[PDB]
């Protein structure tokens, strides 16, 4: 047996596996349990710590994926399938993964913890895009990723009940963070240098750990890629969550205790079958079961918590891809398709705005339409299509990110910001979608270093830069290379100068103001309109 | 007759006139000044529609300008050309309904396209005798026949008790119409062509031209129109009947006064008493608002200009319309705290928010909020230079640029040939501070060709420029097309259309075609802000 692959954590002994990365080997410990399986009577309940086990637990293979929607619309289409479960589904899914250098690091090593996205209804830490071997092998990082419960299983809430209090999916993530604190030193990891990073719902999750005090003792730095805890999709009120749970119960044949009991009798796939049917409006970029403002995990709305919080001793990296909104249009807006250019009419544009801004009044939707129309080409289908994409991306990601950045920076945080502008040469989504939601991730994780993946040389070199930025941030709270070139420097985001950088094949370029005029509209004016 | 110059004697419907031979830089022109076209609207005629001048006997001397209609005179800045060039330059009187005619000398042998100028001044001031409206250059250089009339302003021109016999409103516009009619009947005596008449005017004068386009009885009196920095639609050029009634009733109270009794009492007040109080009846603290303006009476204006431009057939109308680069700057020093002509007028964010309420005086809190958020630069929300300039743009866009863009849009969509410009040259002689840019009113001296007078110290470039402009305007008056049919070489001026939205820059450089008349911003003013009002 290889000593390198044998590790004792508090629960018992594990055996991992030597994996091949392009530059040499890494030690990988996959499918480590961190919670009692949340099954039967534990459905909807907070996670409990995993009981100690005997002998040597095999940790050479990924565990099951938490029960979720599986996309079948386009069999064999990489653009969808790459996000689908790549192991069997099960409610028994609370496992985490650890990659380290081989041999184990000599000194304590900064740790990166990945929290995946997928609208809080989907995702797994086992997807190929989340493979930690490149970061471990090239940058020497200890990289951790956990499964957390998604959909009803993870966020169905009857607020105030003891058996379905909500947010148990975020409690799963927190327990995984507790586990890293307790155990990661045995892998060569430094528990005193832990960086969370995540994308979309994963980024929103990261932000919710920033805003939830018991999580703050578990990490030191944070990265939010294309998502935020604030904004229109990442949380619901207690009353809306109650409504959604109650309707879903009705839809599958069911006081809180009796209602949750009957829910616990239903096959997992019955809940997934009706998951979406409880959304109040015809919408896109809306997910039925998400974190709930409970007065507990979230003491208040994220909007309220980022406005009033002290973020003095926090470092944060945040950013967006060039085309945040395009991916979502094909899931609900008539006229849009992955299989044609989706050149839409003006009528389709006004109808699309109601779907992409589902909570907007007639008057508010009117303001959006008039702001995003180009009045020199008010009927040009191509402008209208690109405008539809912009409406959804700004409302849901870019302006919530600008809002968070400025609030953090103003209240003491050290903030770095980016826009990612390179379209992967290998993308199977059509060209009109540009740089879609989620297609920076593979570069950050360093997938282009895998020659068999048929990326370009430029892309390999790009990925190495991004791995450096991110691991420099994790080591130091600053993405800049602490000695090497130099330059141009990546400056901190501030309210005065509002500087951010472009991440693309050319060298860093510093820009100022993140959709400043347009996010003023979303962030300062439209709210005055509801009010 | 007998020993007089025989080429200066002329008969019109009311009798014989003697004009005067004037010197223009390049030669003589004929001028017939101070021709009466109405009975003096004095005494019991105050506030009433004009009556046509009854014929006179003998030869009326028409060699000097007549009285200016009774109005406010600006006295704030002793010896300041910037205000003084606009002030009355002849005696103030209610007896003021005269017009002026310039032609070549000798008079033209064949019928000659006529231009009629309608002055601005917020409907509370102005005169056809100001130096800046001098017809001699257009007459001499382009062979134009140019007419300009006085029309009543302020209370005397626009005070209304709508529905009354004695003060029906809009009599100032009727003064203008009477002059147009006078031209139809009489201009042929001077060699003008009554079948080719182009109105042009600036600010309230442009708004006036617009109202003649929109009032059916005026339509037979002209063929083509020019609207410089003004429109009949928009926030300032008209009031409702209700609001005009309110303003006249308040004014009456303030000077110590059944409509008949009320109006009768107003007619006993000294003219200067009315002038002394006319500004006191405005509903809000404001700039670019005037108490006594055309009223939507359901007569001269059958409906609001907005409704009329939205639904009118304009198929056989040619129009030329435009703006100066800085429409709003001039109005800020008249009542937005923080602005002066005598300093750079850098302002704070607080003064900007305050100024937006004064400059958009009918905006609700939410509307004002939308304005401030649109015009704020969020990379530099506190920069006092950006804020000063934004204040100016708010006031300019709201009052002129976007009303002009609405007008151009509707006319183009509803059959008219439209030509649009922006005028971007600042007179080397301007006495207003530099921060004001090209302010409201300061294209006019170039259109009338003042720079051709060497004694005015304009540059050579400005003299060449004035000549280009005099050609655009007079080609437009002749053909409905500003383009020179012989200079096919020079860059062309395309029509404004809804599909391409082309307009040109007027400056020292050759014509440049641009697309979209402040298109995004005017979408806010013209499409969104109204939907908010509801
Ligand atoms: C109009 N209406 C009531 C709808 C419309 C669509 C759905 C969707 C659905 C999901 C799972 C299903 N089963 C497992 C049987 C069946 C349907 C759905 C929604 C969003 C989505 N994505 C955004 C990926 C994918 C699928 C449900 C109700
Ligand atoms: C990847 N991609 C572009 C997709 C993927 C999935 C869908 C939707 C869908 C497809 C197959 C289903 N089953 C086999 C059960 C259930 C739902 C769907 C979503 C919304 C919707 N409405 C809002 C009416 C209707 C259908 C659409 C686009
Ligand atoms: C606040 N308030 C009650 C006001 C404010 C300003 C005035 C103005 C005024 C004019 C002439 C007067 N007399 C002949 C005695 C007296 C006052 C005035 C207004 C505008 C203006 N311009 C825009 C040029 C010039 C003057 C009157 C009342
Ligand atoms: C040319 N220029 C920049 C001007 C011109 C006029 C004024 C105003 C004024 C000046 C002299 C007056 N008289 C000699 C009778 C009466 C009123 C005035 C305007 C507004 C106002 N308020 C809004 C209170 C008060 C006074 C101001 C600036
Ligand atoms: C794309 O395809 C869908 C259906 O497959 C269709 O409804 C839509 O009109 C198409 N769009 C274009 C631009 O052809
Ligand atoms: C200029 O105008 C007046 C001075 O009368 C004052 O209120 C304003 O603050 C001044 N602004 C400057 C000096 O920038």
State how far the Cα of A304 lies from the Cα of A308, in Å rounded to an integer: 6
Consecutive H or E run containing B142: helix B136-142
Pocket test for ligand 2, best of A331, A338, A351, A438 (most atoms within 8 A of CB): A331
Domain total of chain B: 1
Annotate A127-149 with b (16+ C-beta within 10 A) or e (fewer): bebbbbbbbbbbbbbbbbbbbbb
Nearest to A326 by CA among A344, A313, A304, A308: A344
Closest residue on chain A to B370 (Cα): A525
Q: Is A523 exposed, middle or buried (CB count within 10 Å of its CB: 0-12, 13-18, 19+)? A: middle
Give the distance (Å) from ligand 5 centre to CA of residue A339: 8
- Compute φ and ψ for B53, nearest 5 degrees: -55, 130
Half-sphere exposure (Cβ direction) of A530: Cα atoms closer than 13 Å: 8
Q: Is B324 exposed, middle or buried (CB count within 10 Å of its CB: 0-12, 13-18, 19+)? A: buried
Which residues lie below 8 Å from residue A250, measured CB to CB, with a gap of 6+? none
State how far the Cα of B306 lies from the Cα of B233, in Å rounded to an integer: 5
Inspect the interface and report whether the beta carbons of A528 and B366 lie closer than 8 Å: yes
What angle do helix axes B349-359 and B365-375 make, rounded to 10 degrees?
130
Question: Residue B66 is part of a domain; what is its CATH number?
Answer: 3.40.50.1820
State how far the Cα of A401 lies from the Cα of A382, in Å rounded to an integer: 26
State how far the Cα of B172 lies from the Cα of B46, in Å rounded to an integer: 11
State how far the Cα of A392 lies from the Cα of A31, in Å rounded to an integer: 36
Task: List gaps in chain A by the residue before each (C–N > 2.5 Å).
Answer: 254
State how far the Cα of A176 lies from the Cα of A35, in Å rounded to an integer: 8
Q: CA distances (Å), B532 to each of A366, A478, B284, B371, in order?
A: 10, 46, 20, 12
Catalytic residue numbers of A? 200, 324, 437
Q: Chain A closest CA to B347's CA: distance in Å?
A: 19
**Residue B357 in tokens:** 């309420």
State how far the Cα of B267 lies from the Cα of A327, in Å rounded to an integer: 73
Q: Which residues of B touch A512 (CB under 8 A)?
A: 379
CB B139 within 8 A of CB B103: yes
Q: Which residues of A touch B523 (CB under 8 A)?
A: 370, 373, 375
**Residue B444, helix vs strand vs coil:** helix
Give the pairing type, strands B20-24 and B15-18: unpaired
State how far the Cα of B232 lies from the Cα of B243, in Å rounded to an integer: 17
CB A97 within 8 A of CB A62: yes
Nearest to B318 by CA among B200, B480, B208, B202: B480
Tell me the residues of B at the A interface, defined by beta carbons under 8 Å apart.
366, 369-370, 373, 376, 378-379, 501, 515-516, 519-520, 522-524, 527-528, 531-532
- Compute φ and ψ for A445, nearest 5 degrees: -80, -10
**Residue A35, helix vs strand vs coil:** strand
Which residues lie below 8 Å from residue B334, measured CB to CB, with a gap of 6+? B287
Q: Whose CA is nearest to atom 5 of ligand 5?
A: A337
* CB neighbourhood size of A154 (10 A): 27
- Compute φ and ψ for A35, nearest 5 degrees: -140, 155
Half-sphere exposure (Cβ direction) of B190: Cα atoms closer than 13 Å: 35
- Compute φ and ψ for A336, nearest 5 degrees: -100, 140
Helices (H), B376-401: 384-396
Contacts by residues B370-379 (CB-CB < 8 Å, ≥ 24 positions apart) = B370/A525, B370/B524, B370/B528, B370/B529, B370/B532, B373/A520, B373/A521, B373/A524, B373/A525, B374/B521, B374/B524, B376/A520, B378/A513, B378/A516, B378/A517, B378/A519, B378/A520, B379/A498, B379/A512, B379/A513, B379/A516
Nearest to A460 by CA among A473, A443, A472: A443
State how far the Cα of A69 lies from the Cα of B321, in Å rounded to an integer: 61
Give the pairing type, strands B192-202 and B239-240: unpaired
Give the distance (Å) from ligand 6 centre to CA of residue B325: 24
Nearest to A319 by CA among A222, A429, A179, A193: A222
Give residue B181's domain range: 1-534
Give the distance (Å) from ligand 5 centre to CA of residue A367: 27
State how far the Cα of A112 lies from the Cα of A221, in Å rounded to an integer: 9
Residue ranges with strand state E in B277-409: 295-296, 318-324
Q: CA distances (Å), B241 to each of A492, B162, B164, B441, in order?
A: 59, 6, 11, 29
- Tracing tokens 């963070």 back to the chain, one arrives at A177
Sheet architecture: strand order including A24-33: A17-21, A24-33, A95-101, A142-146, A109-115, A189-199, A221-225, A315-321, A414-420, A499-503, A509-512
Give the pairing type, strands B192-202 and B15-18: unpaired
* CB neighbourhood size of B375 (10 A): 19
Q: What is the DSSP-derived secondary structure letter of residue B38?
A: B
State how far the Cα of B149 lies from the Cα of B186, in Å rounded to an integer: 14
Task: Provide DSSP, A229-256.
Answer: SSSSSS-B-HHHHHHHHHHHHHHTT--H
**Residue A529, helix vs strand vs coil:** helix
Pocket test for ligand 1, best of A69, A152, A281 (most atoms within 8 A of CB): A69
B340 lines ligand 6 (CB under 6 A): yes
- Tracing tokens 């720079």 back to the chain, one arrives at B451
This structure was determined by: X-ray
CB B69 within 8 A of CB B153: yes
- Compute φ and ψ for B249, nearest 5 degrees: -65, -40
State how far the Cα of A337 lies from the Cα of B134, in Å rounded to an integer: 65
State how far the Cα of B170 lies from the Cα of A393, in Å rounded to an integer: 53
CB A445 within 8 A of CB A129: yes
Half-sphere exposure (Cβ direction) of B48: Cα atoms closer than 13 Å: 17
State how far the Cα of A416 lies from the Cα of A490, in Å rounded to an integer: 8
Q: Is A108 exposed, middle or buried (CB count within 10 Å of its CB: 0-12, 13-18, 19+)? A: middle
- Compute φ and ψ for B185, nearest 5 degrees: -80, -30
Facing B379 at nearest CB: one of A373, A375, A512: A512
Nearest to B82 by CA among B464, B445, B450: B445
Task: Provide DSSP, B161-192.
Answer: -TT-SS--S-HHHHHHHHHHHHHHHHGGGGTE
């Amino acid at each position: 047996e290889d000593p390198q692959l044998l590790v004792r954590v508090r629960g018992g002994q594990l055996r991992g596996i030597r994996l091949k990365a392009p530059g040499g080997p890494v030690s990988a410990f996959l499918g480590i349990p961190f919670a009692e399986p949340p099954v039967g009577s534990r459905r909807f309940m907070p996670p409990e710590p995993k009981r100690p086990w005997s002998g040597v637990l095999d940790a050479t293979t990924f565990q099951n994926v938490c029960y979720q929607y599986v996309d079948t619309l386009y069999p064999g289409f990489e653009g969808t399938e790459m996000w689908n479960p790549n192991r069997e589904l099960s409610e028994d899914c609370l496992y985490l993964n650890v990659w380290t250098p081989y041999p184990r690091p000599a000194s304590p090593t900064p740790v990166l913890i990945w929290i995946y996205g997928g609208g809080f209804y989907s995702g797994a830490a086992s997807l190929d895009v989340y493979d930690g071997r490149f970061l471990a092998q090239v940058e020497g990082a200890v990289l951790v990723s956990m499964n957390y419960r998604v959909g009803t299983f993870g966020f169905l809430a009857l607020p105030g009940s003891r058996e379905a209090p909500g947010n148990v999916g975020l409690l799963d993530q927190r327990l995984a963070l507790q586990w890293v604190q307790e155990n990661i030193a045995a892998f060569g990891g430094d528990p005193m240098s832990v960086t969370l990073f995540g994308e979309s719902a994963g980024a929103a999750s990261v932000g919710m750990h920033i805003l939830s005090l018991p999580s703050r003792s578990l990490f030191h730095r944070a990265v939010l890629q294309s998502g935020t805890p604030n904004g229109p999709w990442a949380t619901v009120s207690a009353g809306e969550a109650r409504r959604r749970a109650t309707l879903l119960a009705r839809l599958v044949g069911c006081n809180d205790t009796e209602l949750i009991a009957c829910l616990r009798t239903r096959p997992a796939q019955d809940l997934v079958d009706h998951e979406w049917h409880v959304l109040p409006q015809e919408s896109i970029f809306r997910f039925s079961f998400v974190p709930v403002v409970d007065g507990d995990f979230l003491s208040d709305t994220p909007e309220a918590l980022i406005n009033t919080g002290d973020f003095q001793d926090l470092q944060v990296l945040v950013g967006v891809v060039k085309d945040e909104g395009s991916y979502f249009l094909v899931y609900g807006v008539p006229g849009f398709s992955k299989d044609n250019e989706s050149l839409i009419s003006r009528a389709q544009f006004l109808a699309g705005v109601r779907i992409g801004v589902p909570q907007a009044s007639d008057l508010a939707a009117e303001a959006v339409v008039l702001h995003y129309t180009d009045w020199l080409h008010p009927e040009d289908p191509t402008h209208l299509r690109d405008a539809m994409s912009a409406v959804v991306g700004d409302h849901n990601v870019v302006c919530p990110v600008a809002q968070l950045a400025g609030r953090l920076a103003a209240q003491g945080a050290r903030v770095y910001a980016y826009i990612f502008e390179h379209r992967a040469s290998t993308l199977t989504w059509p060209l009109w979608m540009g740089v879609p939601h989620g297609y920076e991730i593979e570069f950050i994780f360093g997938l282009p270093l895998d020659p068999s993946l048929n990326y370009t040389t430029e892309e390999r070199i790009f990925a190495q830069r991004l791995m450096k930025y991110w691991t420099n941030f994790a080591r130091t709270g600053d993405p800049n290379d602490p000695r090497d070139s130099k330059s141009p420097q990546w400056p901190p985001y501030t309210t005065a100068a509002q500087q951010y950088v472009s991440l693309n094949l050319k060298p860093l370029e510093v820009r100022r103001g993140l959709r400043a005029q347009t996010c003023a509209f979303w962030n300062r004016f439209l709210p005055k309109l509801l009010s």
